[PDB]
Amino acid sequence: ILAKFLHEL
Amino acid sequence: GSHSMRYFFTSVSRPGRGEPRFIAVGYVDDTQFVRFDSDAASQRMEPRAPWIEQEGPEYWDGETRKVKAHSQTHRVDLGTLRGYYNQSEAGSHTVQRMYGCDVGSDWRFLRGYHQYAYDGKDYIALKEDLRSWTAADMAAQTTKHKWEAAHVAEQLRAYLEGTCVEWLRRYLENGKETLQRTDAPKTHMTHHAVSDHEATLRCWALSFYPAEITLTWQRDGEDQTQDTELVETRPAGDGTFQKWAAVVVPSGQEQRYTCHVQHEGLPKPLTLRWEP
Amino acid sequence: MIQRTPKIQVYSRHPAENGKSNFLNCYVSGFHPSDIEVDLLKNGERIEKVEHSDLSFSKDWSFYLLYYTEFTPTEKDEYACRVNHVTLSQPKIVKWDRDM
Ligand SMILES: [Ca+2]
Secondary structure (H helix, E strand, O other): OOOOOOOOO | OOEEEEEEEEEEOOOOOOOOEEEEEEEEOOEEEEEEEOOOOOOOOEEOOHHHHHOOHHHHHHHHHHHHHHHHHHHHHHHHHHHHOOOOOOOOOEEEEEEEEEEOOOOOEEEEEEEEEEOOEEEEEEOOOOOOEEEOOHHHHHHHHHHHHOOHHHHHHHHHHHHHHHHHHHHHHHOHHHHOOOEOOEEEEEEEEOOOOEEEEEEEEEEEEOOOOEEEEEEOOEEOOOOEEEOOOEEOOOOOEEEEEEEEEEOOOHHHEEEEEEOOOOOOOEEEOOOO | OOOEOOEEEEEEOOOOOOOOOEEEEEEEEEEEOOOOEEEEEEOOEEOOOOEEOOOEEOOOOOEEEEEEEEEOOOOOOOEEEEEEOOOOOOOEEEEOOOOO
């Protein structure tokens, strides 16, 4: 499964 | 023995007001199991292996939500990076991201990854302790500082050591008939005259899985790189891989050369000699 | 910016046997950026039904793709992959060799 969220750069 | 789950994301900007293209693919070991492509008709995460199709609508709905959210993050990031590098709107630029986890023979966590690139070069990556970052340049240092302040590494670490490993184990189980197989290379050698005083010997490894393989030529038992050629390992298209290595030799001296093959599928390295 | 020209291999899925159905592959790899055009050719003419893999990339961030189509090799017919990319002045044509 993919990560649940990513932080912007 | 060991296994990995990896996701690969590419985002490409298009000039002016064109929207960026976003592609996501996921792999267990060397087997692709899902894909998303923003240009494609479905606008959904799609299966690419038979064993993932048994996941129900909740899986596909959740993964499609998440992959869309991933694409939105990369859209913003393309904008941020354009400013950081002082670039115009006229050109196309590319962000790539890879993340995932490896497990050992016992299926316990071995290592985790999260790497990011801009315009084909390393931008920032998570170090192996999963607590600290390596930044390529001044722009990436800005991102490092923001990600430090926001405790991003701690959040990733939870994913890489927890969720990633658990789902990898589930996939390994559900896809056991095809993921837990190794296919040893079928090997052979071919020979062709290249003049009246030289000949090519080519050592072939076919139909193997996983992709990692080593082919090496020896002359009288001594490693030989002079006058050899090795191609990149390549997909056959049916889930296995192919590779060859070749050496140019004096005519009549073919028997001095051996090709050596190492692969997880072989209980011992193979040695081949031109046998016709 | 780090740009890279494509490596190209042209090959069959199975060992070629003349008059037996098989798949002709063109594997393009090592390239950056990702936009690429690939044509599979029989005796210089485009082959009509060609499929391709999903874009992915390698450990050095360079991209790779497989293009493939059904074909039945014979001793006489010439097969080739023709590739265009921003790094190239003109399209590169690689001819199929059944022992490569
Ligand atoms: Ca745009």
